[PDB]
Design a protein around this ligand. Sequence first.
Ligand SMILES: Nc1ncnc2c1ncn2[C@@H]1O[C@H](COP(=O)(O)OP(=O)(O)O)[C@@H](O)[C@H]1O
Ligand SMILES: Nc1ncnc2c1ncn2[C@@H]1O[C@H](COP(=O)(O)OP(=O)(O)O)[C@@H](O)[C@H]1O
Ligand SMILES: Nc1ncnc2c1ncn2[C@@H]1O[C@H](COP(=O)(O)OP(=O)(O)O)[C@@H](O)[C@H]1O
Ligand SMILES: Nc1ncnc2c1ncn2[C@@H]1O[C@H](COP(=O)(O)OP(=O)(O)O)[C@@H](O)[C@H]1O
Ligand SMILES: Nc1ncnc2c1ncn2[C@@H]1O[C@H](COP(=O)(O)OP(=O)(O)O)[C@@H](O)[C@H]1O
Ligand SMILES: [Mg+2]
Ligand SMILES: [Mg+2]
Ligand SMILES: [Mg+2]
Ligand SMILES: [Mg+2]
Ligand SMILES: [Mg+2]
Lengths: 367, 367, 367, 367, 367
Amino acid sequence: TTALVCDNGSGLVKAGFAGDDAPRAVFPSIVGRPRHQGVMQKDSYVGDEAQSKRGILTLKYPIEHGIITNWDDMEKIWHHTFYNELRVAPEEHPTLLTEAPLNPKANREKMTQIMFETFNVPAMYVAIQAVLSLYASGRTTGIVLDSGDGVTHNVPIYEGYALPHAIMRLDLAGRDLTDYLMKILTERGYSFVTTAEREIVRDIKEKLCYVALDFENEMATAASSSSLEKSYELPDGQVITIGNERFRCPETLFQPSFIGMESAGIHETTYNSIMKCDIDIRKDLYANNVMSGGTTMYPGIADRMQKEITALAPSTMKIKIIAPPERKYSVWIGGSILASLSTFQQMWITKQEYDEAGPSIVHRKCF
Amino acid sequence: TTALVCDNGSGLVKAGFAGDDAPRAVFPSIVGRPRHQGVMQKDSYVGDEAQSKRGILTLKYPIEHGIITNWDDMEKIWHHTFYNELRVAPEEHPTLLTEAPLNPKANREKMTQIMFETFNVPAMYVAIQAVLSLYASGRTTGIVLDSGDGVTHNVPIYEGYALPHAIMRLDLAGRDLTDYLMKILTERGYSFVTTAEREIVRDIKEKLCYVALDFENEMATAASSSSLEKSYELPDGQVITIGNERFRCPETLFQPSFIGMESAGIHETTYNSIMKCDIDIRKDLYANNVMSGGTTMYPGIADRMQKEITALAPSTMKIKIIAPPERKYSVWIGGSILASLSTFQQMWITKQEYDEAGPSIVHRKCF
Amino acid sequence: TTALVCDNGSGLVKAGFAGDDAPRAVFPSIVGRPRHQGVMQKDSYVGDEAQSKRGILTLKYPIEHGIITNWDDMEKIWHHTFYNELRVAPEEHPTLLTEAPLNPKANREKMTQIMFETFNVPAMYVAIQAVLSLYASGRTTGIVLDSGDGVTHNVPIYEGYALPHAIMRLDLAGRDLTDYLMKILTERGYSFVTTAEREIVRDIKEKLCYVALDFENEMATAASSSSLEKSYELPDGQVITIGNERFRCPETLFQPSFIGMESAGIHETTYNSIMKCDIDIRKDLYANNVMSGGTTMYPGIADRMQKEITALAPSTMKIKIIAPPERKYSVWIGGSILASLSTFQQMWITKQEYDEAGPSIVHRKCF
Amino acid sequence: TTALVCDNGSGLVKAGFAGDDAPRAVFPSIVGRPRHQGVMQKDSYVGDEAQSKRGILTLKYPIEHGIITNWDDMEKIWHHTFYNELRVAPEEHPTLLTEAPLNPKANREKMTQIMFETFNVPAMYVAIQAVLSLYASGRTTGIVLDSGDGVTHNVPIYEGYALPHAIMRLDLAGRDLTDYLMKILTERGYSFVTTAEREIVRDIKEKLCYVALDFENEMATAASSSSLEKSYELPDGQVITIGNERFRCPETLFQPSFIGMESAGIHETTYNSIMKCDIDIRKDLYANNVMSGGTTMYPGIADRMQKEITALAPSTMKIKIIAPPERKYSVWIGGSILASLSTFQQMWITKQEYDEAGPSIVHRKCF
Amino acid sequence: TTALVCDNGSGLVKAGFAGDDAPRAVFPSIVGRPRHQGVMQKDSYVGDEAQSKRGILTLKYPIEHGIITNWDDMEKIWHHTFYNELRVAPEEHPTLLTEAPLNPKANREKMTQIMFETFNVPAMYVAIQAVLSLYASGRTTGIVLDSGDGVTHNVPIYEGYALPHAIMRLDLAGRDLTDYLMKILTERGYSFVTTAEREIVRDIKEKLCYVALDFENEMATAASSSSLEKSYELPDGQVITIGNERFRCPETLFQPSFIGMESAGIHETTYNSIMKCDIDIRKDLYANNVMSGGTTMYPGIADRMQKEITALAPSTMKIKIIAPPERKYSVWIGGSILASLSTFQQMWITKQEYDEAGPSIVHRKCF
Ligand SMILES: Nc1ncnc2c1ncn2[C@@H]1O[C@H](COP(=O)(O)OP(=O)(O)O)[C@@H](O)[C@H]1O
Ligand SMILES: Nc1ncnc2c1ncn2[C@@H]1O[C@H](COP(=O)(O)OP(=O)(O)O)[C@@H](O)[C@H]1O
Ligand SMILES: Nc1ncnc2c1ncn2[C@@H]1O[C@H](COP(=O)(O)OP(=O)(O)O)[C@@H](O)[C@H]1O
Ligand SMILES: Nc1ncnc2c1ncn2[C@@H]1O[C@H](COP(=O)(O)OP(=O)(O)O)[C@@H](O)[C@H]1O
Ligand SMILES: Nc1ncnc2c1ncn2[C@@H]1O[C@H](COP(=O)(O)OP(=O)(O)O)[C@@H](O)[C@H]1O
Ligand SMILES: [Mg+2]
Ligand SMILES: [Mg+2]
Ligand SMILES: [Mg+2]
Ligand SMILES: [Mg+2]
Ligand SMILES: [Mg+2]
């Protein structure tokens, strides 16, 4: 049987069969529960059902910053992924799961236990997202800036060797930019407070927000013109209108101090990840920055990333930012390649081998 | 045995057997007592007998604004409902009673005690009228504007969940419009003063009154034409003739300030009930306004309700007012459906369980 | 023992035993005393003896307008009623006496005292004449126009409830029409002056007088033809001849201004009695006008009464005047029914109860 | 010129000049017409002339229950008010007329037309009687119980705002108590029947009748003593003597069921008028009951009114009944104040403005 | 001249002169307008005048949730604050205004424009309420839980640095607890509906309501004893009696789900505000919770707040809740300190500087 590839991100579940070139099931990775008692019935809703029904539900994300915080809701979301969205018996297919680097070891151990004991999967693996995202680009060398809903991380790879000491990780990604857009929308007098209202602010961010190429020149232009200012229609048909908020939101990727986060931005953390590498590989990394995940989808993000890294880099270096179309799925496409390589079929952790060695056996290639 | 469904409204008793699609007994819910001593004998008359005999009687309504104010007259009206109008032993049939939301808890408790101890009913329930009225329409989602003789209330329901915080209630309905029509009839020189004369003014209201689509354009037209002006023949064969009074009466549903009532009208209280709901359900509520009860029967009431809510609503929303024929009975038809559902037979409060838990057990699904 | 029923009217005593359908004793209710001394002996004559002997007597009526004005003559007339005309021991039979409404309370009290202390009657009652007259018709609803020798009164009754506030009473009846016929006979040159001559004018009225259907068309016809003109033979065999006097007399029932009486006529007082009633009963009263007593016996009185009330009534109403044959006795026939009802035997005022409670006990159902 | 103030009540015309503190002309408001033809001449008499001459006249009141029922007799009574009793050219003085609340609109319209077109008055107003009666007391807040010959009405006013929804009106006042005293006088054997005899019964009521503080204790005392029993001398010098009739008459203000009137009495209608008001003003109304008009003049009426309202009121409230001396004129004194206020001269409806706007302009402050 | 300090809260205006230790003017911040037309005059009433007169008025609050929704009513309330309650020329005194955090920027801009252009104030500032409330306590470090009529917000401050990212704001405060107490009073059969009746429910809440230390043990005790049950006398002297309603009301601060509000309660939002802070300051915040504003005045609120935060906190931490007497004014007392500091006189926005820089200049220290 062909393998399942389940990217299982913190803000979308992306799942499908290895060798397909887009995921079959892509759904919100939310569990919702009724706020109000029924008078007229399903206790909880998962994914797109909890989006369609979201006004009456509190929405929980069981994954935050790539760490599974509620396990019973994650077992619901996996159960729906296999039985309802893929419509597959999971005990017949090896499943390539996926994780961020530098997660707690217990997160991978308890995930592996749930796969072998609840779902009875025959064989399993857990890849690092930014390794897979490099397979999707075809490259063997590059520094992969992957930024999802939960985590941003740089993994530098050179000719197929990882550099574990150079892996950087930011707990700043799409959800922290939703939580910040809600605060700067509050300055126009738009108040969003419910978990179900944050799912509206997310669609605002996904439609209206872009990256300013020169932040303080856009701040001047929005302070002098309403050409930057656009409108958006709520599910109620009320119309909100937002201005410099359109680029002040993604700017928080480059100035995390906006959210009170003491950190380098994604430019300085990418340059620092490059600078922790040996001088000889550094030129090959500069020419192969690979962007992936949804938070790299903002209009003009690569165009500014190139000009910030060019400003940090020594001026002889060619800086190139490889941000392909469909970089939103490149972690899943990379896993869909990997799971179908003949060289990889050696690496599946088999059920027998997990019954033998226990949860020790799961970190054999782990960061 | 099949259940009894007793809508037991403040201005009509509607009662029958579950699974029938119209009530058997529909009678005025009045107790009358002789004003004059007999010289020529029944101490009190109930319902249609107190209408036929009404000239010699003072008529009391034992229910006002959905609250049972005289219990001995309510025990008379129930006794006649069971033994004379349905001709049924009540101790053999479970009875679905009915109530407005936000009534005093003691009203339901003392009603339940009278059913279990006087009439010895085997099992009982008390539904909210606007839940039932949604079952009658078949819909699982909508905002139900129910307006009887005593109470107007909006109950919003979304996919079978109630939203208790959004339930609105107006103490303004058909009886307050009778009491106001008597005052504006007094301007033509028609004086109605007796309780038995108000039962004439009620039939005037039920026959001649309609809703003006543009109130101040009808007020101009009645100020310039006698095409709006109609006549009506009293029980004495005297002829009265009424003009802008025909629409100034129901207008008090939309401008309660006419009766010195500080309130939103039924349009603004329906829109406010919609606006207390989460933005996601709001579009589904706008398309499913359900009208019910007798005070929604005026010609053109839905046609104006649609155009007032369209004026408050944001202009992208489809506004639809589902006002079916027989909406005068839809509370009873809803209860006649509910009482016959297999899923509902779990919910009957049994006599044994009331002897066990006391009047605590009666509010388990209550607003 | 069976009860005595004594109608004891102001111009005839009608008396008999309950359950008979005509009175046994019907006699003039007159006491006469010799005008001239005897030379050739009874001091006073009562009833038919004072009619046979009337030329030598002054005739007194002890009742005027239903009020007993001379009590010693009323005790004579009762004594003759019991001992000579019925030939009954009064102390063995309960006696249903009778009265007009709105009489002085003392009239009923002193009548009751005379029955309990002179005649020693065991039990007694005093009914209102127009209640009894409705029992005679069998009806439970109607407005009873009773017109005797002394009083005209309307009592409206609806389904066995009296309406005390709507009871009307006219001090205009058969004796005032005798006194007016004597004045308009004086215009033909016939002078009647003695009390014994008024008993001739009464028989003229009872034989020749009728009700004109259109008074001023009969006045024209009598002014142009002697077809309306009839003759009558006195006890002396002298012949008098009377013309428009035949209908100008009863017309005084409809235009009391002829006798200088400021009043509505019997049509307008019947319509006014109907109009003091609640609108709901009014239609049932219009269809059930019941005529009774001797002054309703004129030819064509119901035929004009119907056409005057039809002229006052609103044109949709059915007006019907129930004037049966034997309406001259219907007060007595009603009392003869009432006294024989089992439900009524509760109501006799017993001698013991009068000795206990005094003359307070006599007005328990009184107008 | 100073204004005329014409209270124009249903049982007295009270008229005078604004700024005087008692009316000049106070006369019966009666038109009388000869019952009998002249043989020895004025066709009709008005006011005090129709009282002095009343034995030969039928007396009509052109106003009944505050509604002008005969307009030609009302134009006679106004003509005599201006030309004979005030001796004034009406076309030189603005006239403050007066009305009850809740009268037919046509009554005020036809009154205004008669003033502008027959009498040619320059400017006119029509005040509500119970507003004026509050100006007479000086108070800005209170509930005014005004009871005349035709109407009783409560108008609650709080700090100079009327509460139209709380205005109560009873068609029960001094004339209905004359018509009831004639019926209970008939129980002593005194029969009053002529319109001119009712003007005797009125003076009996005005002299002998009082309010019992505890009705059934006075009924017991009159049933046991002749200390409550007084005598009165007719215009014929005949002496009548009346007992519990002295207080059973005014008691009909508190138990209207005595006249077959289904209603609250003046205590319960005053308390109900207070209870239709918002809770915050209610304490200020309880302390400021203002009595006015002639039917409040009975000895002890305020003393019982205070003790009935104290019995209905919640026991913490101070109840005070402000019944001043000269409350018989306080409607006219209030109008005499109002007409002389500078702030009021804005409000006169001018002849020019009535020719412009028609009878629409007359209800600008109307109930 | 000394500065004015105007706290200008959503439910009270508190105003005075800097350096005084209690405000001079404290008044309701209400504008009321007559519901009824005058017949006997001020178009609108402000503050304590609209409380004294409230029965006849609709009351509007121009501030809701700290946002000024009606500007013309806010200009009335400021005009009365300066000219009538303080009796001061505002153009001679710099005025420290005040605001909640995270308000719309336009609210502060339009407030500043009204001060500089209508009232012509020479210099102005707008402080954050929870900064001021810390100055009142004297502390330089603490987390300030301020809860007024409109907003609850936590502002954590450490040694005089704010932590903008940790500022939490709840749209749940005293007015939402009045609106909820009206709904749970409706369960005893007490219906409060008018805006003027909500001002009665507010005084019920302020007198009878307290915080249960163990909510479900008080719910059991009130379900078993009437020792928790107290009575209160309306302005009408009617007596209402309320039981578990006394603590179910304030419990909505801790379980907002009672009002259908998806939120943490004030305990969990205070703990979450502490947890968004860096670990080193967290111990210093736990020992310095500062309570302020009126909704913290309930008996026992600090005693439960301490025991909920102790339950969330890690057990080694000292938790202390600094809830001083007069915490109801501590925002104003803090502003009265701040306005008198010499170091602060640098910070006044001068009129000249506002004419120069425009409404940009107003957010220089803003959240
Ligand atoms: N086109 C877009 N523009 C901006 N942001 C986006 C876009 N698509 C997704 N995002 C944001 O990125 C996150 C989803 O990224 P994704 O890579 O799907 O996450 P995951 O790795 O959890 O699947 C969300 O925060 C979403 O708001
Ligand atoms: N066809 C009609 N048109 C207008 N009003 C009506 C009509 N039918 C009933 N009503 C009014 O509505 C009330 C009766 O409504 P209903 O729904 O039967 O009340 P309940 O819920 O008490 O049974 C009465 O006030 C009646 O006057
Ligand atoms: N057939 C008749 N036609 C006209 N008048 C009659 C007739 N019979 C009796 N009356 C008159 O009516 C009165 C008697 O009526 P009646 O009902 O017998 O009186 P009472 O009620 O006193 O018995 C007398 O005035 C008599 O003249
Ligand atoms: N002193 C009095 N005692 C009792 N009743 C009186 C007195 N004065 C007048 N009335 C009665 O009140 C009515 C007159 O009241 P008034 O206020 O003058 O009426 P109007 O408002 O029509 O002028 C009449 O019915 C009269 O009988
Ligand atoms: N002693 C008290 N007990 C309970 N609640 C109170 C008390 N005093 C005021 N409140 C409530 O708190 C709010 C007023 O708080 P306050 O701090 O004065 O508000 P603002 O910040 O708007 O001035 C009102 O809702 C009032 O009902
Ligand atoms: Mg991902
Ligand atoms: Mg109903
Ligand atoms: Mg008779
Ligand atoms: Mg008057
Ligand atoms: Mg505040």
